[PDB]
Amino acid sequence: KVTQERMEQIYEEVKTPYKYGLAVAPTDNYHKIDCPTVFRQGDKWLMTYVVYNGKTGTDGRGYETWIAESDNLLDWRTLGRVLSYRDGKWDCNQRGGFPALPDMEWGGSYELQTYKGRHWMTYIGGEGTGYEAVKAPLFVGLASTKGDISTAHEWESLDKPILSIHDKDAQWWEKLTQYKSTVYWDKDKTLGAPFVMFYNAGGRHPETDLKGQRVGIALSKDMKTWKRYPGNPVFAHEADGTITGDAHIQKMGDVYVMFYFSAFEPSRKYKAFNTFAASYDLVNWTDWHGADLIIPSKNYDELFAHKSYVIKHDGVVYHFYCAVNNAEQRGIAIATSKPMGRSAVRFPKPET
Structure with a gap:
């Protein structure tokens, strides 16, 4: 067990009281944005994120994965897709990715690591349409690239999942469907x-x-x-x-x-x-x-304030999360350890 005093020290180190606002938001009500992963290469900060292309649980096709860039962690510009709908394969309709092998050091380099000359990513994959596992279960996929990770290009992926609910050695806690995965390199x-x-x-x-x-x-x-x-x-x-x-x-x-x-x-x-x-x-x-790190408190996160990626850089903590409001509009927002200004990004007007 970690002592109560040590836990109180970790809280003071990681907490982010000040909400900046939205980082990446949809431009209409028929797209939803979620699942940030933030890393850097040389002079740029990078974020992968997932997009669902519907308003309801059944009108969209499913997830694709996109990438954006930033110079200051706060203002973001979308570049394009890195995992796209893949006709004819086991993951044709759901392709929602999470970069692998990050540098785990708190306040460290935030660079992704390479193995056998490639960068790696796991993903939520499946063949059902609609939002997530509504029409069919989701399984864990593996992708990789020898390309420049700061560019919008398609990463290569395997023709079957790496873990599935139908595996002989699947356990009770994973029998219905699998969700997010991250892979770490433990030296x-x-x-x-x-x-x-x-x-x-x-x-x-x-x-x-x-x-x-x-x-x-x-x-x-x-x-x-x-x-x-x-x-x-x-x-x-x-x-x-x-x-x-x-x-x-x-x-x-x-x-x-x-x-x-x-x-x-x-x-x-x-x-x-x-x-x-x-x-x-x-x-x-x-x-x-003690007190939760991020909770609903503003118009734009009034229903859910959830999912995490955390960067400590130059004495400031940045906590990236998925903001959902009562209209069910969904995007990525940021909170910080000290005030860093306010975002100009807004959700569109909600539908009546």
Whole structure:
């Protein structure tokens, strides 16, 4: 267990009271933007994000992945697609990606690392139309490139998923559908392998029969073949339909810090929010006991303020999150540790 005093120190280091506003927003009501991943190469900051091309749960085709650039982390310009709808393949309608092998050092370089001469990315993939797993389940895909990661070009991907709900060794917590994944390069081989994936998925608890989303681990020597960690799930909040998800891990000295979101947690009035947990060993996690890091408070995040990517740079923390309002308009927003101005970006007028 991480001590209460150490946890209070981590909170003071990571907190972001001041909301800048929207970073990337849709220009009409028939697109939704979510799932930021921020990294840098040389003189540019970069963000991948996912786009759903509908207003309701059933009118869009599904996810594609785009990329944007910035000089100051605050003002962003979209470049184009990096994963596009892929006709004839297992992931034809859902292609929602998360860059892999980030430098995990808190306040470090924020560069992506290479393995066998390529950059890597995992993704949410599937063949059903509509929003996420509404028409068919989602599985974990693998993509890579030898290209310039600061350019809008299509990354290459495999012709089957790397993990699936239909695998012989799939576990109870992942039987309904899989969701976000991130792969880390653990030089120490803490769990007996160089590549460690944290991912969330849906399933029912074998004791209580309660449905929810929970977080677990898979392991690989080569990025291609994966074994589930036998002690899964490693992090969960057990109440009916509660979601724990989108794990984002950074190393702060000798402790790992997991930024995560939860939704439909009965102990909170608001419906979705961000907070953190900590661990010395990647498996046993101590949950923060104090105020949540990001909660609904403004017009543009009044329903959900959720999902995390966190950058510490030149003495300022930037916390990227998905803002959803009561009209269900959806985009990416930013909060900071000190005031850095206010965004000029707005959602379009909502539909009546």
